[PDB]
Structures are given as C-alpha cells and as structure tokens.
Amino acid sequence: SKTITLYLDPASLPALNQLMDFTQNNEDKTHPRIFGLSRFKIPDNIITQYQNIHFVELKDNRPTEALFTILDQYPGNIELNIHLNIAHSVQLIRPILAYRFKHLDRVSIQQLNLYDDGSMEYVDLEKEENKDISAEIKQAEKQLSHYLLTGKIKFDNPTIARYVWQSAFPVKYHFLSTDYFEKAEFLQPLKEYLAENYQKMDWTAYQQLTPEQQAFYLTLVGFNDEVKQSLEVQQAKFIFTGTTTWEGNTEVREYYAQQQLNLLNHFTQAEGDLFIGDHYKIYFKGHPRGGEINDYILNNAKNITNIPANISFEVLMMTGLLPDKVGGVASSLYFSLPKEKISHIIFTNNPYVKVMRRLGIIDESQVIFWDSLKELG
Ligand SMILES: CC(=O)N[C@@H]1[C@@H](O)[C@@H](F)[C@@](OP(=O)(O)OC[C@H]2O[C@@H](n3ccc(N)nc3=O)[C@H](O)[C@@H]2O)(C(=O)O)O[C@H]1[C@H](O)[C@H](O)CO
Structure with missing residues (x-):
C-alpha cells in the first residue's frame, strides 16, 4: 500500500495529541499527511521541511471537498490512518467515507485514533445515566453499519455512537479521563465493550521527546x-x-x-x-x-x-x-x-x-x- 495519515480536529485537545503524534514521527519527511486543525497553524519553516504535506479546511465539523483533490494525487492502493475528535467523529469521517465509496477498489481505512474533544464527551455520557447501555451500544452498531453501507447518518443515540467504531475498524481511543469510565458504574457495559481499545492521554509524552x-x-x-x-x-x-x-x-x-x-x-x-x-x-x-x-x-x-x-x-x-x-x-x-x-x-x-x-x-x-x-x- 501507500499509507496516508489524516489529522483532523476542530478543537484543541485532539490537535495537541495529533501534533504530538506528528512530532514523534517527524524524522519521516515524505510520509503523506493531511492536516485539518482549525486552531493550529503549522509554521511555514516547518512545512518546507516536508514533502507530501497537505492542509484542508473544516466547515461544519467536516473537511471540505478540497480533501478529494488532495487524495486524487495518490493513485495506487491507499490506506488511511485517520486521527479524529471523538465527539465529532461521525461528521469528520463523512467526506472520507464518501471518497472511499467512489474509490472502493483502491481506498481502505487502515485504522482510527480518536481523542476527546474535552469535557463535552463526559457531560454527554453523564446524560445517559438511566439508559440500557448494552442495548444502546447494539443499536448504535447497527446504525453505524447503515452509515458505512449507505453513507447516510441516522443515530438514535449520537452519544453512544461515538464509541462503537470498533465494530467496523481497528481503533484506539485516547481519553482525557479513564477514571470516568472506570468509576461511573452505569458505564460498566461500555467500559467492558471497549475492552482493550482505549488508553489515557499521555501528558508525559513531551518529556520523552x-x-x-x-x-x-x-x-x-x-x-x-x-x-x-x-x-x-x-x-x-x-x-x-x-x-x-x-x-x-x-x-x-x-x-x-x-x-x-x-x-x-x-x-x-x-x-x-x-x-x-x-x-x-x-x-x-x-x-x-x-x-x-x-x-x-x-x-x-x-x-x-x-x-x-x-x-x-x-x-x-x-x-x-x-x-x-x-x-x-x-x-x-x-x-x-x-x-x-x-x-x-x-x-x-x-x-x-x-x-x-x-x-x-x-x-x-x-x-x-x-x-x-x-x-x-
Ligand atoms: C461541555 C462542552 O461543551 N465542552 C466543550 C469541550 O468539549 C471543548 F469543545 C471545549 O473545551 P474547553 O473546556 O473550553 O477548553 C478545552 C481546551 O482549550 C484550552 N483552553 C481552554 C481554556 C482556557 N481558558 N485556556 C485553554 O488553553 C485547553 O487546551 C483545554 O483543554 C473547546 O472549545 O475546545 O469547549 C467546551 C465548552 O463548549 C466551552 O468551554 C463552554 O462553552
């Protein structure tokens, strides 16, 4: 294949993590990368050091169709390594899925890395306290399947839908609070479902650079x-x-x-x-x-x-x-x-x-x- 890495985030926390991922891999100057970070500007003096580096605008929590133009520049079989904001994951990936549909013979999703928008994911989870979490998860998986098959979005529980990507792709979640998932009893079915697919944001990563x-x-x-x-x-x-x-x-x-x-x-x-x-x-x-x-x-x-x-x-x-x-x-x-x-x-x-x-x-x-x-x- 050829792997293309996409770093997408309208907020601050996921971008901080994604820029850390970029920094950790900054020895590789030719790896294709697409940055769609609304709050962060990569300095020109850094940009000129890299080849196959691209930028895309986000609008309404989705990369614009300018994304297609970029991907069209990579003709062979391509695998996408996608980094996304958890809260906005469904919209952020919408155009990528749309492109894959058009090029199904050539374009595949390699993996997803998801990072918390911030406190919104937790406030939203807190509002699910009285639901049958297991049943919500099962219904979200079915509706994600519909999304992947038809390209149409309709989720009865948009909050729980954020956590069912594993039913479709290799995924790793990076949480601002792993304690929340381990301390909120009502979330036990979701914590167990997530199995070995999450870890805490590692704030000591900078010290290891x-x-x-x-x-x-x-x-x-x-x-x-x-x-x-x-x-x-x-x-x-x-x-x-x-x-x-x-x-x-x-x-x-x-x-x-x-x-x-x-x-x-x-x-x-x-x-x-x-x-x-x-x-x-x-x-x-x-x-x-x-x-x-x-x-x-x-x-x-x-x-x-x-x-x-x-x-x-x-x-x-x-x-x-x-x-x-x-x-x-x-x-x-x-x-x-x-x-x-x-x-x-x-x-x-x-x-x-x-x-x-x-x-x-x-x-x-x-x-x-x-x-x-x-x-x-
Ligand atoms: C519930 C809800 O909607 N939570 C969201 C949250 O998921 C995320 F979208 C965000 O995050 P939020 O808690 O404001 O701020 C997350 C970050 O932005 C940086 N920061 C923030 C404030 C500050 N004075 N100095 C900083 O540097 C820090 O990196 C931090 O981690 C956001 O805009 O990114 O704003 C909120 C709030 O919608 C908004 O705070 C209340 O209207």
Whole structure:
C-alpha cells in the first residue's frame, strides 16, 4: 500500500495529541499527511521541511471537498490512518467515507485514533445515566453499519455512537479521563465493550521527546520564549482561566464577559469571596475562542499578564511552567491539572458538576455558580 495519515480536529485537545503524534514521527519527511486543525497553524519553516504535506479546511465539523483533490494525487492502493475528535467523529469521517465509496477498489481505512474533544464527551455520557447501555451500544452498531453501507447518518443515540467504531475498524481511543469510565458504574457495559481499545492521554509524552523535538513541538503549539520568560519570574503565580460561549447573542456574550471580570475580582480583590491573598503575580489565560470576552478582561483589569489565548493551558504543564495556583470557570484544562494547583473552579442536577464530582476534581460541598457572586465595586 501507500499509507496516508489524516489529522483532523476542530478543537484543541485532539490537535495537541495529533501534533504530538506528528512530532514523534517527524524524522519521516515524505510520509503523506493531511492536516485539518482549525486552531493550529503549522509554521511555514516547518512545512518546507516536508514533502507530501497537505492542509484542508473544516466547515461544519467536516473537511471540505478540497480533501478529494488532495487524495486524487495518490493513485495506487491507499490506506488511511485517520486521527479524529471523538465527539465529532461521525461528521469528520463523512467526506472520507464518501471518497472511499467512489474509490472502493483502491481506498481502505487502515485504522482510527480518536481523542476527546474535552469535557463535552463526559457531560454527554453523564446524560445517559438511566439508559440500557448494552442495548444502546447494539443499536448504535447497527446504525453505524447503515452509515458505512449507505453513507447516510441516522443515530438514535449520537452519544453512544461515538464509541462503537470498533465494530467496523481497528481503533484506539485516547481519553482525557479513564477514571470516568472506570468509576461511573452505569458505564460498566461500555467500559467492558471497549475492552482493550482505549488508553489515557499521555501528558508525559513531551518529556520523552528529544530536546530538538520539544522545541519543534513548542513551535507547533505557539509557545514562544517571551511567554516562557513571563512565566519564569521568582514570584508566586496565579493564572485566571477564561471561558467562552458559542452563543452569538450580544446580550449573552456581554453577560459572560461581565460575569467573568467580576469572578476575577473575587479572586484578586481583598474583599472577594475567593481572595487568594497578596503576593501572587496574576496572569490571564483566555479561552482560545473567547474573542471579545478575552479582550474585556485585558481592557478592564489591572496588573495582569496575558498568556496568548491560542496557547493551550496544558503546554505549561509540559514545559514545567505551571503556576502555584489556578482558578476560574470550569473547563477541560482542570481535568489534567495537578490537584494541588486548584484554587477554585466556578460554574456558569448539572451534568458538568456531576462529572467533576465523580472524578474528585471538586468535593462534596456546594458548588459556586458565578451568578451567586456579588458585583464588586
Ligand atoms: C461541555 C462542552 O461543551 N465542552 C466543550 C469541550 O468539549 C471543548 F469543545 C471545549 O473545551 P474547553 O473546556 O473550553 O477548553 C478545552 C481546551 O482549550 C484550552 N483552553 C481552554 C481554556 C482556557 N481558558 N485556556 C485553554 O488553553 C485547553 O487546551 C483545554 O483543554 C473547546 O472549545 O475546545 O469547549 C467546551 C465548552 O463548549 C466551552 O468551554 C463552554 O462553552
């Protein structure tokens, strides 16, 4: 065959993993690769080092038909090594399956590697708590078969459908939380079904790269020396982490921005409900897609050092530049943050809260929603 590797992801977590996979295999300069990473730009100085390297836009959680043009350049029998976001796996693979249909004599799927979008997969699984999980799995397998045979998507349980790819292809799942699958009793039928097809995201992978590869990885994720320097100060550090909303509604976006600024004040102001104390150097790590919500913090706060929103929080853990304390709105970065670094996690019963409780990320005490916090000032 000829193997072609596809790295597809509209979010941040799967892309971090996929770029790690690329880095680990970066000695091979001619392996055909197609990158469809919405939040990551491979620098030109890296691109020129590679041959058979291609890029595809994602739209509506699927690579566009520009994908076909790329694949058409590889005439022989081709095997696809596909890396995907778990939550959006069905849509992301849709055009690839469409191409295989057209070239069924030549194109085959070699294997799938799936990575969590983030907290969405867990919140969605939490909503399945009262279902006959075994029956859901069996029905999802049947509907996946229909999808593979007809090219048409219709799943009664879109959540469980994310976990039945093994009924069709060799697959490996990479979870942000393996504990969830092992601690949530209602998921026992799914944990058993998945058998030996999953593992945890390996956050120590960066430490196993050579120093030259580590530097390569950092350029792929946007972690420059200026940011590193800003984090190397001797003073104790607190990073306030931002969130976002997908709502376009101006009122909702402004509400999020206002509530988030108020939350920051509760951490940093002496009269705040979450006051961290004096002597912490304050940083802001905005959400990669926070937009004007991020700007609102920088425009209205004081004595805060920005960490470019496009830099994923987990990169700090890789480089050993984690701060003393971290607080802000619940987000996927808290799933991998060392427990000793948590100041307070705030939420905007609630399935996200339940997930965090099951995992011990938060304790038994009443959670704090940001609308329960007095408007300081
Ligand atoms: C329930 C739900 O919808 N969860 C999704 C989740 O599956 C994933 F789609 C995402 O992930 P989410 O928890 O926000 O953020 C996951 C990442 O983005 C980076 N990050 C985040 C925040 C921050 N201040 N600095 C960072 O660097 C970190 O790498 C982390 O792991 C996402 O957009 O990728 O956003 C959420 C939320 O829809 C959104 O948070 C609430 O509207």
